[PDB]
Amino acid sequence: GVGNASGNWHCDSTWLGDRVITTSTRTWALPTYNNHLYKQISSQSGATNDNHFFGYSTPWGYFDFNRFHCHFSPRDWQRLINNNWGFRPRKLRFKLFNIQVKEVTTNDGVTTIANNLTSTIQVFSDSEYQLPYVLGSAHQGCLPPFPADVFMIPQYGYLTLNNGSQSVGRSSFYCLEYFPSQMLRTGNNFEFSYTFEEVPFHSSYAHSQSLDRLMNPLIDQYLYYLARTQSTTGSTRELQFHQAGPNTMAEQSKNWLPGPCYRQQRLSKNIDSNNNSNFAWTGATKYHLNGRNSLTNPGVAMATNKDDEDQFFPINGVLVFGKTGAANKTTLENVLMTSEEEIKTTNPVATEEYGVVSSNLQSSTAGPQTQTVNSQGALPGMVWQNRDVYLQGPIWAKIPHTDGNFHPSPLMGGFGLKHPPPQILIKNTPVPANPPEVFTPAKFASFITQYSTGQVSVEIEWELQKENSKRWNPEIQYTSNYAKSNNVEFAVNNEGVYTEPRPIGTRYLTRNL
């Protein structure tokens, strides 16, 4: 009813062993988008060939909770990462309640808001995945990390096949009103459930060993390797074979290789150490698709740097978050950089080459020649780790429906799902203004300005993978600084603005490689 609440505020994180259920409730607002119209959108004429697009902006909004800070509080995230070797999402429950549709008159420079007890809102989940999926592109407009913050629902829109700024016959147009939808008045609520597919546990650990250091450092190998081609004490030719041992670990026979590489240019956090040119685009690592160059950002998972090089990062091979209050264009001091240095054990460094291969056939007259492999694809015997997930980073990405894929793990980091949580589209039902007294066939374009508010609750049940290490020495754990400061870490300031000072990964416990 009008005076009866259709739901309650559930914000909790219950731990049960091998299982944690996180429920987050947020207050949401929804404007009318596009004046209830579908608008064709395209890149401007002056846009570069690489930024051409064609698509449609709809009057619908969508709910996005595809970020770990939507469901995990910093304390909950700390509990997860400091005590578990892995985790994955198991169950999902979505609820929409306490809906209030409000009319706005905005007359004579003063806006008056009134309750509209008969207007409805249309809500539906694309459980059959018949709409373009957009909850996989690190877009803004998700649930605020802080439960007390109210957020504005983002406007739904999609892109289709384009030829420059034009569309081709293969381009598809989607009308969301063509789907079945549930209509909610102030007394109604919407609910639905979803089950995640069996997906691998996310690696919440770093390796205690490197791939090239898996041998016994005390015994020798029974296999021989060519140690010298020229005999010492003069320029004499002879094939010398040695058994590799502890002192020649680099020459030992191994069973595994580091993961695939797609090299990226290196930048220094000290500006004076970088080349004096604007190479953010020319020097960036890209891929070619239909005559378009697109950044490989963040690209294949690779170590951000090697030992003692924390001030170097790949040109575009690292996820970069914004500090609280940061603008859409800022400098290095106002952004937070993730570091994938934990995967140096098995992944190549993003800024270095994969290796060197022979590029010719040597002879008594032709000396050996080597070639640097700056991009190596999958090889047999390769092992690697995926990009680390972050509290403020994405959770899941839809796997493209294609004939083939290789290791369908999202490059931005998270879980790849063939049937991810369906998009939940929400819209304010149009409420026409007074029609003309004499019939006219012209399109109706007079609407009473309206918006909506409500509560949205998302409950995710995650399965925990328990650490079982026999490590004797204490582990590295995520912890907050104990030093005095003007503001508590992960809290509000004197202005009531919630802040996330730094990014938190998951790889603090360690596993044997």
UniProtKB/TrEMBL annotation:
<feature type="domain" description="Coat protein VP1/VP2 Parvovirus">
    <location>
        <begin position="1"/>
        <end position="485"/>
    </location>
</feature>
<keyword id="KW-0167">Capsid protein</keyword>
<comment type="similarity">
    <text>Belongs to the parvoviridae capsid protein family.</text>
</comment>
<keyword id="KW-0946">Virion</keyword>
<keyword id="KW-1140">T=1 icosahedral capsid protein</keyword>
<dbReference type="GO" id="GO:0005198">
    <property type="term" value="F:structural molecule activity"/>
</dbReference>
<dbReference type="GO" id="GO:0039615">
    <property type="term" value="C:T=1 icosahedral viral capsid"/>
</dbReference>
<protein>
    <submittedName>
        <fullName>Capsid protein VP1</fullName>
    </submittedName>
</protein>
